[PDB]
Design a protein around this ligand. Structure first.
Ligand SMILES: NC(=O)c1ccc[n+]([C@@H]2C[C@H](COP(=O)(O)OP(=O)(O)OC[C@H]3O[C@@H](n4cnc5c(N)ncnc54)[C@H](O)[C@@H]3O)[C@@H](O)[C@H]2O)c1
Length: 248
């Protein structure tokens, strides 16, 4: 992962996106589902197959807010810096804070909501690097891109971002067709209840998050609105935006 000096520069460039990643990490770690949802897991807290969640929870509770972590020297918060550097490291993607120009663009690409919806408090964009970025465009070719929503519990978003949405084909189930998406934000929001984030977060301690996916228009995508649809191949979609709602 990144060193401390590199992480300090990466966090300083976009404090709200660094905070979102710490918040989603804290949500996944605090959940009773941490064993399955805190993936990727920081290898320094594992002894082979044995994940030391008590030591990890104990060290995550020592993280100060990001402004204080940056306002102070490195050797003041050693375990904190090692953890934050790992949280902000990825060779696959990065997250950027976005504005009203990008939210207006999302509304245009998904269509005017049929039903009243709240405006998000924060909006983030996921940028992908090669080989993942070039792989997605090679799969796309000349095909059109469709934008659709996927709601989920807050504790799933650390894993959703780094591993992608599960396209789990389960023949022994009522809901094993693949990834379920909807063109309507109001339908996705009922699947995004408010969850516990990070107490020292700039975004607030209680958040709801909705994924905006970029979907390749392909026959394997089973049906700019078209109610709710199913994606059977994980190569045909990627999470592109995160709509974040902070409970006041
Ligand atoms: N999710 C929505 O926005 C949405 C909207 C409208 C209808 N539905 C219906 C709800 C029902 C089953 O779908 P649903 O429960 O949403 O999906 P699911 O049954 O396919 O999966 C279970 C859970 O896994 C979550 N998940 C996906 N990828 C990951 C990952 N990498 N890490 C941790 N968690 C992950 C996912 O978000 C969902 O909550 C179908 O009838 C859907 O059409 C869902």
């Amino acid at each position: 992962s990144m060193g401390w000096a590199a992480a300090r520069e990466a966090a300083g460039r976009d404090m709200l996106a660094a905070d979102l990643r710490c918040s989603l990490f804290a949500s996944a770690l605090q959940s009773y589902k941490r064993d399955s949802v805190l993936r990727p897991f920081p290898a320094s807290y594992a002894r082979g197959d044995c994940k030391d969640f008590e030591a990890l929870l104990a060290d995550a509770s020592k993280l100060p807010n990001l402004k204080e972590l940056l306002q102070s020297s490195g050797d003041n918060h050693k375990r904190a810096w090692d953890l934050v550097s790992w949280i902000l490291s990825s060779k696959v993607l990065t997250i950027h804070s976005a504005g009203k120009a990008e939210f207006e663009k999302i509304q245009k690409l998904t269509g005017a909501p049929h039903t009243p919806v709240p405006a998000p408090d924060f909006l983030f964009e996921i940028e992908y690097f090669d080989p993942a970025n070039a792989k997605f465009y090679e799969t796309k070719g000349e095909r059109d891109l469709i934008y659709a929503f996927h709601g989920s519990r807050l504790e799933n978003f650390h894993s959703i971002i780094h591993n992608g949405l599960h396209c789990h084909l389960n023949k022994t189930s009522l809901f094993g067709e693949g990834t379920y998406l909807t063109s309507d934000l109001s339908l996705a929001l009922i699947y995004s209840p408010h969850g516990h984030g990070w107490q020292h977060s700039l975004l607030g301690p209680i958040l709801s998050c909705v994924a905006v996916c970029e979907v390749i228009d392909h026959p394997d995508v089973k049906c700019i609105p078209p109610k709710y649809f199913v994606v059977t191949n994980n190569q045909l979609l990627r999470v592109k935006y995160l709509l974040v709602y902070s409970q006041k």
